[PDB]
Design an enzyme around this catalytic site. Structure first.
Site, PDB file in Angstrom:
ATOM      1  N   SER A  33      33.682  60.151  53.806  1.00 57.31           N
ATOM      2  CA  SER A  33      35.001  60.598  53.262  1.00 57.31           C
ATOM      3  C   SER A  33      36.155  59.598  53.462  1.00 57.31           C
ATOM      4  CB  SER A  33      35.503  61.924  53.845  1.00 57.31           C
ATOM      5  OG  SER A  33      34.863  62.929  53.119  1.00 57.31           O
ATOM      6  N   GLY A  34      36.967  59.490  52.458  1.00 57.36           N
ATOM      7  CA  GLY A  34      38.254  58.914  52.554  1.00 57.36           C
ATOM      8  C   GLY A  34      38.127  57.434  52.205  1.00 57.36           C
ATOM      9  N   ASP A  38      43.044  65.412  46.513  1.00 55.25           N
ATOM     10  CA  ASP A  38      42.534  65.064  47.880  1.00 55.25           C
ATOM     11  C   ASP A  38      42.850  63.621  48.246  1.00 55.25           C
ATOM     12  OD1 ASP A  38      41.206  65.194  50.330  1.00 55.25           O
ATOM     13  OD2 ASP A  38      39.187  65.279  49.488  1.00 55.25           O
ATOM     14  N   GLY A  98      30.787  61.416  56.612  1.00 54.85           N
ATOM     15  CA  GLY A  98      31.328  60.392  57.420  1.00 54.85           C
ATOM     16  C   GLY A  98      31.707  59.249  56.489  1.00 54.85           C
ATOM     17  N   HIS A 105      41.645  65.979  53.158  1.00 56.67           N
ATOM     18  CA  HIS A 105      40.842  66.692  54.100  1.00 56.67           C
ATOM     19  C   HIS A 105      40.483  65.852  55.340  1.00 56.67           C
ATOM     20  CE1 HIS A 105      37.150  64.843  52.054  1.00 56.67           C
ATOM     21  NE2 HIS A 105      36.765  64.758  53.369  1.00 56.67           N
TER      22      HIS A 105
END
Lengths: 29, 223
Positions: free
Chosen positions: B177-178, B84, B175, B40
């Site tokens: 994420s990932g 994801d 912020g 995402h």
């Protein structure tokens, strides 16, 4: 709700991903 | 990061920032040419920033490299956030140094109770908004599958795990994420989703990296 943790500017709820909503300082959450 | 502390400059050298105008996700440098992040987080025109601490202020350890290629996992589902995960190839290799270093991939999955490090530049309030200048850190345990699945009925697949505190008060957040979840020096987790931040009985949900090590080592050595 399923809300991804990306930092995303918005102006309305419908701007956001998934079941994030657009909160008060213009960011999804 | 809600509830956390300040990692200190370049003490998490595999942490990178994905930037399209501004910072919007993290990621983890897993060699000099590839970063891992959340699917995402995909955007066209990512610039990847390495060697950051203060994202607003140039402290001169940084390296800014565009993404040449982004490879979203084939079974990614944007409705359920299952699978994801995504790989970004850099347009040039980064220089590895003492501020810029890559994180290993796990050889097995990690167990419930194992303490991990989570980092990122995301929101530090669980009500409201406060986005930090400098990279924040949090130590948090992997929670059981039971306790995860009951926190999120219906929503937990075998590619996810919960980490954090059922009590609330500390979690990752928008912020982040990932970005990494690192346990015993291996990358176990990617920051993915949650219901709010740091809410009681709603811990964060992370992509389960150990289920993907093959697919990553495959993709990387073939692209």
């Amino acid at each position: 709700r399923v809300c991804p943790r990306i930092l995303m500017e918005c102006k309305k709820d419908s701007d956001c991903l998934a079941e994030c909503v657009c909160l008060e300082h213009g960011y999804c959450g | 990061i809600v509830g956390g502390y300040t990692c200190g400059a370049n003490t998490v050298p595999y942490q990178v920032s994905l930037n399209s105008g501004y910072h919007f996700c993290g990621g983890s440098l897993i060699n000099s040419q590839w970063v891992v992040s959340a699917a995402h987080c995909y955007k066209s025109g990512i610039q990847v920033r390495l060697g950051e601490d203060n994202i607003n202020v140039v402290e001169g350890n940084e390296q800014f490299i565009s993404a040449s290629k982004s490879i979203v996992h084939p079974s990614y589902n944007s409705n359920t956030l299952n699978n994801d995960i995504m790989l970004i190839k850099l347009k040039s290799a980064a220089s590895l140094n003492s501020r810029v270093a890559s994180i290993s991939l796990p050889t097995s999955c990690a167990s419930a109770g194992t303490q991990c490090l989570i980092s990122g530049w995301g929101n530090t309030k669980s009500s409201g908004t406060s986005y930090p200048d400098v990279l924040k850190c949090l130590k948090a345990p992997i929670l059981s599958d039971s306790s995860c699945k009951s926190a999120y009925p219906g929503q937990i697949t075998s590619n996810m795990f919960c980490a954090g505190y059922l009590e609330g008060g500390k979690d990752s957040c928008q912020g982040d994420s990932g970005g990494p979840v690192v346990c015993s020096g291996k990358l176990q987790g990617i920051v993915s989703w949650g219901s709010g931040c740091a809410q009681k009985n709603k811990p964060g949900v992370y992509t389960k990296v150990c289920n993907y090590v093959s697919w990553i080592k495959q993709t990387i050595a073939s692209n």
